[PDB]
Point group: none
């Protein structure tokens, strides 16, 4: 046989498209226990989401950093500014100030990820250097390890390790599917990892870039059991034991809270007819 | 503009097969039903016959079965086979059921892409991907001639009794065992019961409340097969076979390997009369033995 | 309608991957086992050195049933490679090899070996990275892969979907439990070392006695950090902190590229070496030695 003319099956195309835009993130801290030497306390990855130099990573990668270093595959190194974070989704946004343009992750807003889709994880596991691993989408809408939390996760069996956090999960076309965030863990679980779906990542990134934080609408309270003191809920004369069937002209069928969360603070909305003005929820 | 291109996917396989893979819940009283174990199962036919692993349903006071579509049933145990670790369940369903695509013509090849479908850690239905790594594996234990398919598709607690399928959604096997022994954390080594073998065991369980195999009362090692032990009052004992004599062939089939022979004896229906050539004192003798059913 | 499959690569390459057994008398007990690859018809086999170290007897078993006693042709601990030789009256399967093929990150690969002595196993993954060190020796230059690798895969093949040899599975990252991080020796390096081992019984390497590292972009070249005492470099008067700009009439652009060039130089050769000391170009003459024994 002669295989010189033949062509090896490969996802190199997806790699050439996406990899240049995935970065190594280093959380550096002053060792105040010793002699203030600068040490890496956490490392992870990030994704360059647009030419202006806005980068997505996990909040847990950059927590407690005294300094955040971003390294590109082309060799460039930057001090990164923390634009904002959001602990509810474990997302964070960084900004780098490169004069020269920079590569961006391919993003197809119309693409719907499907269970069974081939995916590639791109990150800096154990600081070995950028590493590409292959798996499939194993499941969708998972919510992750922690019970509830109102989180929607893609599950994947692409091998994921400390250092992958904040990095890209893409398909065979190089399109961003999600941000790798979490590995499931007497046995040791094999091939169970979680990513924030890209639709959600882009949504939170835009909010963080705009307000420096994620502003969520708040009600202050489907049967009611507790009404927050002096909250938008308490107002409009809402009662303990009160019952609600509709909100903002929608069926009260978790779904309600995701709906209210997007609602801008200041807007007024009828319920049961009690009239409530939505206000900003303070997470701290 | 990748916008008009098509992503590599195994979604097709998932759509065909996944609806037919179920969550199996083992309840044990202590007046309240409590999950003592959980695993997966595959709907084989429209009747509502389901395949799972025995270890999953062992000592279950009540067996609940849950479908991806939302329906929940209480299953009854048709039968279970200790050797192959298989068990069959029955649920009385209305409006019919989804079933696992089966192709008896399909010969699994090493290198074929496969998907494992199951309920790892009760997370919910999970799909993982790998290939067929080998076939005919004895598994973790040399004994038992398991004839497992080996795969590097990720298998975890909760995958037991669940389906392994190819890129066409066709059942390749039943996920059963993971390699966990050294220290060393083994990576990508799991075992499935091949679908052909799994079908046979099922039918024999639906027909009889058990699996009937041929017994010949012999314990031997590997050309010929030495007889280390001769089960007392067994088929071979009655035939007068002695310890330390070499067996050349059984039922007109040469005994090159001990594993293949013990597989052949199981197949022979109890009561069958067969030839058994042996070498004793450098002599050849063809005895006549009557097969009996393998003791409980 | 045919299932997606890499069986072709399996049917092409797997026959040429053998089970390798290292035995010693604690009579003969198996002290280690791994895999190996049949490279050419003459019966030369490649494997890792750490698989066949301190073997009283080396057994090689093929997938077609044949079993041989292997002769140890040579080994090289710097690259952890070793060559076996078996004598077969019948023809031998050989590993498919394409010298022109350039491995790319993202290429689908199969690992073929004998993990835990279960029998020949095939696992699937991709090429995760290239040019990976480890190992400060800087003499291994691994391909990284996520095809499941376990004890027993060592010495076995990493091939692409065409059955073409990509590399020799050598290492598993062990530093929680790391998942999907294994390393293989690239076939180009494997072949180079094989032919050398077969030819000389060992890998004959030139040596200058210097610990050096290229700088980031001042003249470019290799900075001398250490100077092995009584080594060729020390004798010729090279010092720590001078910059090597040329070695044997070739530009010193890359520490790795130069180190590969020094290795090719026959011991005893007297070569020009141009360095930078105090912004002055100096030309020193070193006599190459053979690389020190492990």
């Amino acid at each position: 046989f002669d295989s010189t003319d033949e062509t090896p099956a490969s996802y190199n195309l997806a790699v050439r498209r996406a990899a240049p835009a995935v970065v190594n993130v280093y959380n550096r801290g002053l060792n105040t226990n010793s002699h203030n030497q600068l040490e890496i306390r956490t490392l992870g990855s990030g994704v360059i989401m647009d030419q202006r130099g806005y980068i997505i990573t996990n909040k847990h990668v950059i927590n407690d950093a005294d300094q955040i270093i971003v390294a590109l595959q082309d060799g460039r190194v930057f001090e990164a500014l923390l634009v904002g974070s959001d602990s509810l989704t474990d997302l964070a946004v960084l900004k780098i100030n490169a004069t020269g343009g920079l590569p961006t992750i391919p993003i197809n807003a119309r693409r719907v990820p499907h269970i069974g889709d081939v995916v590639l994880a791109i990150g800096n596991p154990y600081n070995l250097g950028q590493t590409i691993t292959q798996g499939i989408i194993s499941a969708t809408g998972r919510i992750g390890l922690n019970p509830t939390g109102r989180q929607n996760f893609l599950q994947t069996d692409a091998s994921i390790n400390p250092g992958n956090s904040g990095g890209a999960l893409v398909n065979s076309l190089g399109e961003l599917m999600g941000i790798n965030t979490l590995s499931f863990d007497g046995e040791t679980p094999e091939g169970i990892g979680f990513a924030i779906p890209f639709q959600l990542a882009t949504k939170i990134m835009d909010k963080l870039i705009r307000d420096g934080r994620v502003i969520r609408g708040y009600i202050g309270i489907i049967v009611v059991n507790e009404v927050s003191p002096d909250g938008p809920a308490a107002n409009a004369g809402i009662q303990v034991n009160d019952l609600i069937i509709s909100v903002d002209n929608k069926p009260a069928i978790l779904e309600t809270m995701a709906q209210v969360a997007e609602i801008r603070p200041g807007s007024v909305i009828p319920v049961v007819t009690l009239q409530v003005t939505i206000q900003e929820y303070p997470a701290t």
